[PDB]
Amino acid sequence: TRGIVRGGETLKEHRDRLMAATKATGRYAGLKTLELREREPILYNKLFSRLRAGVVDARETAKKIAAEGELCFTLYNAAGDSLLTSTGIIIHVGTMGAAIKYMIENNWEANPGVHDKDIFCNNDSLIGNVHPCDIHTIVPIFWEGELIGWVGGVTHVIDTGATGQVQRYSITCRKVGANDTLFRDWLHESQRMVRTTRYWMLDERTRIAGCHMIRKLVEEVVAEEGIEA
Amino acid sequence: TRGIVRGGETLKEHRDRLMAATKATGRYAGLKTLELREREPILYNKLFSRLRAGVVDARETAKKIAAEGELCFTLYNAAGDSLLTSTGIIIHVGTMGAAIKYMIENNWEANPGVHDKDIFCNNDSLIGNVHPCDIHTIVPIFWEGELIGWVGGVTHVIDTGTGQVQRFGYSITCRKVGANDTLFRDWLHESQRMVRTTRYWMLDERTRIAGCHMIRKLVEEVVAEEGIEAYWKFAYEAVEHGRLGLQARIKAMTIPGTYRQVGFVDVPYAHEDVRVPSDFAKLDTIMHAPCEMTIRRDGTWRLDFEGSSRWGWHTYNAHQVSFTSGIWVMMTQTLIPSEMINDGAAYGTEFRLPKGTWMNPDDRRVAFSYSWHFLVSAWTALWRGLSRSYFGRGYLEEVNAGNANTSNWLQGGGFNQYDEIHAVNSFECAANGTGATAVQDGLSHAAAIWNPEGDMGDMEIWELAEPLVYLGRQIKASSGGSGKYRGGCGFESLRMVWNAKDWTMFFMGNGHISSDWGLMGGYPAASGYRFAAHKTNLKELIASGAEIPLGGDTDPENPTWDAMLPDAQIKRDKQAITTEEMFSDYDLYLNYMRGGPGFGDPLDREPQAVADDINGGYVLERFAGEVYGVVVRKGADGQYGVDEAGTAAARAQIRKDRLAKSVPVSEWMKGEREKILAKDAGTQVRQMFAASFKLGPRFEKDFRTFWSLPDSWTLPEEEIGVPTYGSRYSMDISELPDVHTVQFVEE
Amino acid sequence: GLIVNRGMEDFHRMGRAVQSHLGYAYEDRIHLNTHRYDPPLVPRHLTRGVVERTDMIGTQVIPLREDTARDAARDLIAADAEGIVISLLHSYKNPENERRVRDIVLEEVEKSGKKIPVFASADYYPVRKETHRTNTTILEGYAAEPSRQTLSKISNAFKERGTKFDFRVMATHGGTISWKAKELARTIVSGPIGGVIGAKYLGEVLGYKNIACSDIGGTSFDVALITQGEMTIKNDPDMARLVLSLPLVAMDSVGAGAGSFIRLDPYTRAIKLGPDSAGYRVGVCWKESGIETVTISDCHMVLGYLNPDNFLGGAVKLDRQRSVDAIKAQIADPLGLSVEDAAAGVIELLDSDLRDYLRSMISGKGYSPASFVCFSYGGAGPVHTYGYTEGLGFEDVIVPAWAAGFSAFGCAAADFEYRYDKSLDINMPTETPDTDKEKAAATLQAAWEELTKNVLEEFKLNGYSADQVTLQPGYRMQYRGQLNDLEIESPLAQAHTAADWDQLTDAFNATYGRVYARSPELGYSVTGAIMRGMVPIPKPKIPKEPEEGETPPESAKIGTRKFYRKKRWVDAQLYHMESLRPGNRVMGPAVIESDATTFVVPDGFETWLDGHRLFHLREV
Amino acid sequence: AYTRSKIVDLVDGKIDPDTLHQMLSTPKDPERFVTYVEILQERMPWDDKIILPLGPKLFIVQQKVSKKWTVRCECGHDFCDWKDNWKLSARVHVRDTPQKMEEIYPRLMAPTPSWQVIREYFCPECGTLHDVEAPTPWYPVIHDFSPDIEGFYQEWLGLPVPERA
Ligand SMILES: Nc1ncnc2c1ncn2[C@@H]1O[C@H](COP(=O)(O)O)[C@@H](O)[C@H]1O
Ligand SMILES: [Mn+2]
Ligand SMILES: [Mn+2]
Ligand SMILES: [Zn+2]
C-alpha cells in the first residue's frame, strides 16, 4: 500500500474521495447509514466517551507545564476533520484543521514527507489563523505503518513580536522535528521571534506533550477496541 | 573517524585548536612556516589560480539568470575562514563566515547535523548581516566522507518585506533547507510568504545553490588532480598568507603612529514627516563615530572606536560582524586592492567596538535595515587617516579625502505602468562623487563606497522598471568639496510620476550633516536636502505650453522651478529622511546624489580649474571668488575666463580677511567652554555627548580634560528633555539560552 | 555637435559613470584612484536640448516644442559645428519627435548655407539605452568621414602598386563592408574576430559544428565558441572605453599574449602574468629591444621551444642566455627553483589557466569538450596547444598550417554582409487570438522593411542592385523572463498572418533545442529585429591536396633541439612545417617550425597532417 | 624607481595619466620618501631639515640650531613641539551661523550650524588654511596625527633618526 493513509490511498486521494462523496450525497463521506452507531451503540458511545475523556486528560495534564485558556487540543481523522476537542477555547479547531488540509493538498506526503514520530508547527496567516501568536503543533497518528489521524495542539504565546501596523512571523506547516525530537536550527530560530524565551519554550513542550499523550491514547484505544471499530 | 572534519576532530575541536594556535603565536593556525608555499611554489600558485578562477566562473555562470549587485561567492576552510572570494561586493565574506562559525559553536554537527549534499540558509540578525534581505546559502564540502570546507553564496533580494524602529519588524538562523541537494517543500512554501513577489526570491535561490554546487565540484576536481595532501595545507596556509600580505602592504605604503579622526551624520526623527509609531523614537539624534587608528612597527594596526554614540530607535544601527566584514570593501580600494583578499587580512587587524554602541549594540530590539546610512558615514574618516600616512610617505597618488555619503536612496512603492507590484528601483546612488586626491580633483558621479565600479544606469532602462520619467539628469553644481583639488561632484535627476497607482515615495540620506570631511585644507562635500512637488497641475502646464521644470536644481538658494508651479504643494527643506508619502502622476521628486570631499586650501587651486568648473557646471559662479578667490569674466563665446591680476589681489585680500576674522584657538576655546558649562546646545548635540560618555569612559575623560571642566559639571542624558527609552534598560543577547555568539571584536 | 532632450544635456559627458573604469583589470577596477574619465566625444558647449519627452510605449508626455529645436540648431551652427547628432529618449519606439527635430535642423542648416551633416539616432542605431546609442551615433558624425580619408589612403597605397579592386573592412558583426559605408562606427573593431569567422568557415567545409577557438598571440589570449554552426553576438559591448550599440562577435580575453610579463608580487611573492605585455618586443631575449622584465617568450627560450635563430625567419636576433639570466634573477632564485623549473612552472600555470577557461566556457554552454573540436591558431598557439588541451577530451585538436595568419585568413573568409538592428518589445502569451499574432507580425515586419531599406542603400552606393543582394531576416526572441544569447534566422522573408507568427515562434523553439530545457509556456518576447544582406565575393580556397606516405621526407628534417618538460631534458626532432606532406605523421618529441610559428609536439603526443594542411594533435 | 622630475610633477599635480596609473598599479618604490622630502626641502624659504610632511604647507622640521623638532608652516612660522597639536597654537574661524555657511555653500546644501560646524584653522602669519574640521558644537579640537618618526626612519626606511633635543 503506497499511499500512507490506511488502505493505500494518498492523503489527497483519500480526502478527494470523501469530499466528492460529501458534495454528491449531502452527507459527510457519503454516510447514508452509521453502521457502528446503530449496530454497536455501546461500543460507539464508549469510543467517544473514552476519547473525549483522554483528550481532556491530555489538555489538563499538559497545562501543568507553566504558571491561559486558549490552550486546546483536537483529534482529527486522516482527512483533517475534527472528531473531538479538549476543554478550552475552540477557535483553533478549523485553523489547525486547515493546516492539515494544506499539507494534504500541497503534497506534504512526498516532500518533506509525513512520517511517524514527526513534529509539525504552524501559524501561517495565509492558511488562516486567529492570532499571529497562536502557534500550532500537529502530530500524525499512525497504526501499523499507516496514517489514521492527526493531533493538533495550540497555545496563545504572550511574548512574540511585531507598533501601528497597517499591512502584513509565518510558520507554514514546517517540519520542526523527527523521531519525536526537535531540530536545533528550529529551536534557535524560534528564540529570535520572542521577547522572553520562557513562554515560547514551555508552550511548545506543552503542545508536544499533549499531542503525544493523545497519540498514545489513540494507539491504546485502537489496540483494545480494534482498528476496524 | 568520530568528528566529521578531516582528521577526526569535530568542527569545534578543530576550530578551537586553530584559534588557540593563532593566539599563542600571532600567526593563523600557528603557521610559523608555509611549507607548501615555500617548498612547492608552483603548485601553491596553481592552487590559488585555479580555485580563484573557478570561484569567479561560478559567480559569472550562475549570474546568467536575469530578466550585478551584492552577488558573491566565497570558499571557506573547515574552521569557517575565507580562502578565496569571487568577483563582486565582498561585504558578506564575514557575515557568511560568522554563520559557519555559529554552526560550529552551537554544535550543528550533532543537531541538525552537517552532512554531504546538505543545504543551509541564513540571514540571521544576531549572527550578523548587512541587510535583512541578504540571503546566505551555505553548502559543506566533503572529501571521502570527511568535511574539508564550506561554500557561501549571497544575493540581495529586492522584493522582500514603513518607519521601522524595532527589530521585531524576518530571520533565518542557519536553517537546513534541503538535503541530498534537494530543497524541502515546507521551506519553499514558507519562504515565498516572506516576499511580495515570487520570481526574484526563487531565481536567487537557484543562483546561489548553483554557484555553490559548482564551487563544490570545483574543489572536488582540484583535490582529485593535485591530491588532498596539497589542498589541506593550502586551506590554512592561504589564510596566514593573507595576513602576511596585509602586513607587508602596511609597512610599504603607510607610516607607524596614531591617527585620530571622527565622523558624524544626522538622524532627524523629530520632523513630522518621519511618521514613526513609537513616540519615544521621535527625537533628533546624531551618529558619533570616532576612531583612533594605531599602526604599529611590526605592521599590525588597530581600529578603536571608543567614545561612539549609543544605538537608537531607527534602522541605521549595525552589527560588529556587519561593521568589520563590510569595512574591507573600502580597504580593498586603497590599501589592499588584491584578488587574494581573504580572512587573513582580518587576522592582521584589531577592531575594538565598545559594547552598546551603534556598531555593537548587543540588544535584540535593535534594527539594522538601512545600516549603510551610518556605515558609510563612519568609514569615510578612515580614508583621511590612511591618507595622512600616504601623504607623509610620499605616495600622493594613493591619497583620497574620503567617500561621499551614498545617499538619496530613491525608494518607491505601489503599482507601476504595467499595473503590477513595484520591485525595481533606479539605484542612481551607485554613482556619487569621490574624494579629492593630493594630485587631482575627485571623480564626479563615479562610485559608491560599497562599489567602486559605479554604474549610473540608462534612463531608458529605469523608465521600463519605474512609473517615473526623467525631466532632467544633470551634474550637481557645488556638491563637491572645495579645495586645492575639488571633490567629485554628485548629480541629480528630476523624476515625474507617470502611470503610477497607489504610489508612495520617501527620501533617504544625510541632511543637516555632511558625513565626509575635506583633507588638509579641503572642505566637506555639500549636505543633503529634499525637493518634492505635489498637486503640480503639470498636465495643464504642459498642454498650455507654459514653463515646465526641467534639468536639475541648479541653485536651491535661488530655485527656478518653484515659481513655475504656483498651485503646487512644494516641500523644499533639509529633511533628507522621510517615511512613505503619497505621490501621484505629474508630481515631482528630486533625486540628489552627494558629492565627495575636497583636498587642500581652495585658494591654492589653479584659477583655470575654477573657470573650467563654472563653464562645466561643477561650481556655481558665486563661489568662484568667495571660496577660491578667482576673478572670472564672461567672454563673447559665453565661457568664463580667468582675470589674472584680479585673482592675485583677491587671493591676497582673502588672506588678510582670514587673519582678521579669525581668532586664536585659545580665545575661541574659552568661549566654547562657557557654552559647554552653560550646556548651551541643541538636544541632539547634548544627547550625542551624554550617550557617548556613558559608553566611552575614556572619551568622557578626554573631553573633560580638554575643556578643563570641573567634576561638578555633569551631562546626564536623563536631564536633556528628550526621550531616553533604552538608555538604562536593555535586552541583552545573553538572555537567550543555548545561544553561543562568537566575538570578532574587543568590547 | 549634439542635440538631446532639454534638461539632460549632461548624460553624454557623464559617461554613465561606468566609462571611468572600462577596460580595467580587476585590481584596477577596485582601486578607486585609478579611475579616470576620458574627455567627452562632444563637449558641453556643443550640446543643446529641445523640450520634448516620449515615454517607453511612444506616448508623448511632453509634446515637442519646435521653437526650442530651431534655437538649438541655430546655436550649434553659430558655433560652427561640423556635424549635428540628434538623440532623444525612446526615439527608437516613436521617432516622430526626433525626426521632426531632424527636419528642423536640416532646414536651419540650409538657411545658413554651411555644409553640416545631421545624424538622427533613430535613423542610424534605433536601439535602447541612450548612452550606448548616442555614443555610437556620435561616432558617425565624429570619426566616420575622417576615417574614410584614412582608408582611402590605405586603399590608394595598394592601388598604385597593382591592386585593381576596392578594399573591404571588417565590421563588429563578423561581416565585411565598404570603407565608404554610410555607417562606419561598425569598423571600430580591432580584435581578432576574424579567427572566429575563419574557424566557422572551415567548420562548414569539414562538418565541424562545435568549435572552440583559441587565438594565442603576442599581445592577447582570445577564445570563443562556435556552437551548432552559429557564434555568439554581444549586442551592447564597450569599446575605446565607450558604451556602444554595435553587434559584436563575442570573444573573451584571457591574458596579454606570449609577450606577457612575469613578475613576483612584492607583498605576496605570487607569480603574476601581465596585465601588460612586451608585444612586438618579444621579451628580454631581444637585447636591442630594451625589455628588462622577463616574458612568457623568454620562458620558451629557456625551455627550448622557440628557435633563437629563426624568430620571424631570422629577422629578430634573440639571445637565449639573456632569458636564462633574467629568469634566474627575477623568478627562479626568489622561488628557490632552477631556471628550467621556473620557466617550466610559468608555462604550467598559463596552460592550466587556458585549460580551465575552455572547459568552463564549454561547460557553461551545457556541453562537454567531447562534443567540441579545438582550433589552436595564432603565432604562439601551436606552442601551447599540447598544454591547454591535455585530457579535456576534445573530439579533435587542430592547428592550421597558416596559424600565424589565421585571423587574417578569416577576414578574407567573411561575407560581404551589411547588418542593421532595431529594438522591439513584442509581448505574446502562448495562447492569443490570431488578431494579436497578426499585429505582432506587423510590428516585426515593419521593422524588417525599415532595415531592408538601410541594407540595400548600403549596397546601392557600392554599385550593387537589390536583385544581387541576398537578404536574411532575423530577430532576437526569448521566453518571457529568460534572457538568452540566441539570434534566430527567420524561416520567412516576410510575415503577415497569424500562421506566419507561429512559424517564427517554432523557428525559435527549434534553434533553442538545437543549441540546448525549454519553457514555451511563459510565452515569447521579441526585443529586436535584425536584417542582414549578403553579396557573393571571392573567398580563400581551402587546400585539398592528396595525402602521401606517413613518413615525412628526410629533407623536412632540420636538426634537433633540446627542450625541457616534465623535469626532463629531451632531444626533439625539428621539422620544416611547409616541407611536410599531407599524410605525414610526426611522433613526439618534435618541434615543427615555420618562419612565424612553432608547433611543439612533446613525447606522449603525435600529429598527422591532412590534405587541407591541417595538423591534428593526438595524445597517442 | 621613478625619475626625480616625474616625482616633482606628482608633487605639483602636473603628473601625466600614464605614469600616475603606473604608480598606482605597480609596486611602490621604497626610495619615494627620500626623494619626496628632498624635493620639498629644495622649495622651502628656510633650510631647516624636514623630517615629515603633514600637509601641502605643514611639516615637522628639525630646527638647525636648537635641534628641537617643531611643526612649521611653509612661510616659516613654528607652531609647537612635534608631540603637541599644532592647531592649539593656530587661529580659527568657526562658521556657526547660516550666514557664515552660505558663504561657502548654497542654502539647503549648507550644513545646519546647530548640528555641524565648520572650523577653519589658519597660520597666524600668512593666513594659509592648513586644515578644516567639520564636527558638532562642543567637540574638542582633533589631534589628527601622532607619527612614530623613530620607528619610521629606523625600522622601515632603514635610515638614521635625525638629531633631536
Ligand atoms: N617563429 C616564430 N616567429 C615569431 N614569433 C613566433 C614564432 N613562433 C611563435 N611565435 C609566437 O607567436 C607570437 C606572435 O603571434 P601573433 O601575435 O599571432 O602574431 C610571438 O610573440 C611568439 O610567442
Ligand atoms: Mn490567541
Ligand atoms: Mn544587501
Ligand atoms: Zn604660514
Residue numbers in the entry:
A (entry chain A): 14 to 80, 87 to 181, 189 to 194, 199 to 259
B (entry chain D): 14 to 80, 87 to 180, 189 to 196, 199 to 776
C (entry chain E): 95 to 610, 614 to 717
D (entry chain F): 2 to 166
Reproduce text from the manuscript describing this model.
The first structural rationale for acetone carboxylation is presented here, focusing on the 360 kDa (αβγ)2 heterohexameric AC from Xanthobacter autotrophicus in the ligand-free, AMP-bound, and acetate coordinated states. Like many carboxylases, AC is a heteromultimeric enzyme complex. Its architecture consists of two heterotrimeric αβγ subunits joined by the interacting α-subunits to form a dimeric core.
First, in the AMP-bound enzyme, the displacement (11–18 Å) of several amino acid residues that participate in nucleotide interactions leads to closing of the substrate-access channel. Most notably, β-Phe405 is displaced by 16 Å, to a new position where it interacts with the adenine of AMP through π-stacking, capping off the access channel. β-Ser391 and the helix of which it is a part rotate into hydrogen bonding distance with the ribosyl moiety. Second, a new internal channel opens up in the AMP-bound structure, connecting the nucleotide-binding site and the Mn site where acetone carboxylation occurs. After nucleotide binding, conformational changes within the β subunit result in loss of an interaction between the side chains of β-Asn578 and α-Glu85 and formation of a new one between β-Asn578 and the carbonyl of β-Met571. The Mn in this structure appears to be coordinately saturated, with α-His150 and α-His175 as monodentate ligands and two side chains each bound in a bidentate mode (α-Asp153, α-Glu89). The structure of AC in the presence of bound AMP and in the absence of these phosphorylated intermediates may therefore represent a trapped state, bound to the product AMP but lacking intermediates needed to proceed further in the reaction.
